[PDB]
Amino acid sequence: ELRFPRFSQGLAQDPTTRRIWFGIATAHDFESHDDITEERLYQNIFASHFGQLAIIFLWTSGNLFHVAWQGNFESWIQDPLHVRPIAHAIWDPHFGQPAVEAFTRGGAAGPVNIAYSGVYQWWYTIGLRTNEDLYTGALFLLFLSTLSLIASWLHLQPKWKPSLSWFKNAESRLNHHLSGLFGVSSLAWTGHLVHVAIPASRGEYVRWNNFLDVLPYPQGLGPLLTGQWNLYAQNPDSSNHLFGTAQGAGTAILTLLGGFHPQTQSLWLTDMAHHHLAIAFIFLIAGHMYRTNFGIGHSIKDLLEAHTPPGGRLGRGHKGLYDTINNSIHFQLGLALASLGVITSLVAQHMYSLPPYAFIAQDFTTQAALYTHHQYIAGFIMTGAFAHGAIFFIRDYNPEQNEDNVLARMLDHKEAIISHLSWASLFLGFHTLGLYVHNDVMLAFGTPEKQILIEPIFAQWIQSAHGKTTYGFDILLSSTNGPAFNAGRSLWLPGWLNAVNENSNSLFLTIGPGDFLVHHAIALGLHTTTLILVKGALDARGSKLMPDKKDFGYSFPCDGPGRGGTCDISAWDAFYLAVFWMLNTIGWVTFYWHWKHITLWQGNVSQFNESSTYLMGWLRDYLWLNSSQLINGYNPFGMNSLSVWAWMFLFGHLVWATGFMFLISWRGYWQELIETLAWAHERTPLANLIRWRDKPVALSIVQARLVGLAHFSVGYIFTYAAFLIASTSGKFG
Amino acid sequence: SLETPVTSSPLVAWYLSNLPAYRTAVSPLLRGIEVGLAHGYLLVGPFALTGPLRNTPVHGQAGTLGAIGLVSILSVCLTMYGVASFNEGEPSTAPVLTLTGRKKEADKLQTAEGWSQFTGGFFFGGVSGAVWAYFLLYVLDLPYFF
């Protein structure tokens, strides 16, 4: 110790500036802290978690406070399709006068920012109606944040910190989390939907003052007890419904309609109440599986042992995986990220097709800013899952306790996994690019029919299995004979089939040859991205070039020039190269979503369906064409609202281009440059009176990679995020 | 190092050795107040003439406010150094040997008490210098190019 950092003595005595940089990056790595013990390791994590909940609640109290102090929330409700939602107010004392005018919009009095996070619609749907609901909404969350900060402190004192056995109780935790956390919360959210939300959308204002008088259903709390639940779906909202008033307002609370609300282009309220009620039950019943204290229920250790296939094809099967998971934090985190990485992509995919908030399918910019947002989050999280897979194989894996089980075998044929991933990537790469250049050339010479247009028929067959009639394949749910059709003709099909054939929504868009070629480009990304990460994980423990890689840790610079040079060998670097392919891959996904929708919203769907088969079509008709309004944010003639997005656009290009400087130019050059400089400063008069306390040295090899990637990612997000918002909001269509 | 004309010559070695930072044998409070005088009176120009209010009739009083702050910030950046580079009872770190080899006294400036005196000299001189520009340039203001 003896100075910053307090948690690492080896860094403390480092005299150079390396200590300061490395005292920040290794703050949260609790294992490598000096004098750590397994009780501290958990107790810090538990306290740290409460710190992360404090931020989340404080963060959400910010949004409610500004939207209700500087926002259009009461006015926006009065006409959702013609009043720009307002995020907050602008007070920047560098603004000149024509900017102050330009950024005054949305019916405010000074400059403001238009909110594209779509909070305004979400709070409309879930029943909020004035400013005052929001203020108490702010206070409450602010209080919840205060409560969490107490807890993070409380569980560090003696007589309030859990022991080891408390955290390692994997059974009693899975009951509560499955039954209490996932379970009851979904049941209670159903309660709010049918006590406030649904009554709000029928003109009834129900609040904590009076929510005891009002009845969710005029015969409420009976029909459920008797067993004839067949009354809560009796008389739903009429087709001609106005979302905020009583016209056509039915009285059903739980339904199964499945279509869209005709006016607001969203899912029906009464479906969403039912669904959270349905999956409120599944988790409750799924919550009583494992044994805690009462002598019934499975033992997760036993289930793993029992599933050992006879014949030996899976060796000793899942034997011993209980302890290996239940003792390796980096294992548990890996699984959490993998599951969280998927559903976030799932959230992105479902929200834009089935708009769950009122008046959010016609705010085009909000759609794009949301779907693009969640995919990039999902791209990052999924990379972490493999990254903490590698740390598992290094720090916590044990090659004895996992003898021949399913886990050790994945280290036994690592050659077979790696090569085939290489094959599938190569096959997709050659031909997806191959057919593309061919399509490009054939159009360069003035012959568009000589392209290779492969009809994506399997996805068109599936769309025909869900009821889309454009392709006329006449299969299940698209053919009248099918029992599957008959099994649903009176429950949800009339609404679901009416939504799927409507040509305004994004539910099952028509796909053509363009969508075939892009999907493989997407598919190419996933394999190649996986290949780097999977190659990193399985070779973390060792390989032929260095069969004792485990003795150095997850992240080390290199192993020297010998044996032919070993640059970029740490499993860290495998994560490093991976991010580049993630950003490229997610680049190819969000690109595709934006252009397909931006042609749709204009009703010009032919433009995508032809230009999207040759690369110059993507460069001319999407990038070059749609950026005409963005780059004019400010010119020698004047400025516009779009100036801020024009500025950020270049700011994105600048950070990105600084990224190259750290990736290409490596350390040894700069270190020789500092030494001359640290000589000049030591001989200049009037400036040899000031002496560095910490000697100046160039960044370390790994730090430059991390720093270089930080710029590349930041510049790559800001650049696209500016173009995505400005181009769409410029036309608002 | 090397002895070139620039690093050693009678004109050079007399210019440097007789300005406050190097007059190692006078009280560091004054060595702070001279330094703050020259610097403070210096930077009142560009703030007043090139700032964002140069066109307006407040260009005189908007530059001076700007220079006053910059002196204050450097006063903080001065104190942060003095409080983090010296200890309250540790002696001076200045060289005590001249070129001839005569072992002279260590500079009091390179000392926690001395430096805290020096910043008191700089701050008071810095604001005093930056008002003296404003008085001259907008009372006795004929010949100048402003």
């Binding site: 007070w91 920047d92 004392p93 306390r693 | 910030i73 903080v76 983090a84």
Partner: peptide, 30 residues
């Protein structure tokens, strides 16, 4: 009104005190 006070405080003062506070803590020695 209120922004004209809170914007400078979080933009100018609160950074300055923060940077000067850390700088002493980082550069301590015991």
């Amino acid at each position: 009104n209120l922004p004209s006070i809170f914007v400078p405080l979080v933009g100018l003062v609160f950074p300055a005190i923060a940077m000067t506070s850390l700088f002493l803590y980082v550069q301590k020695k015991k």
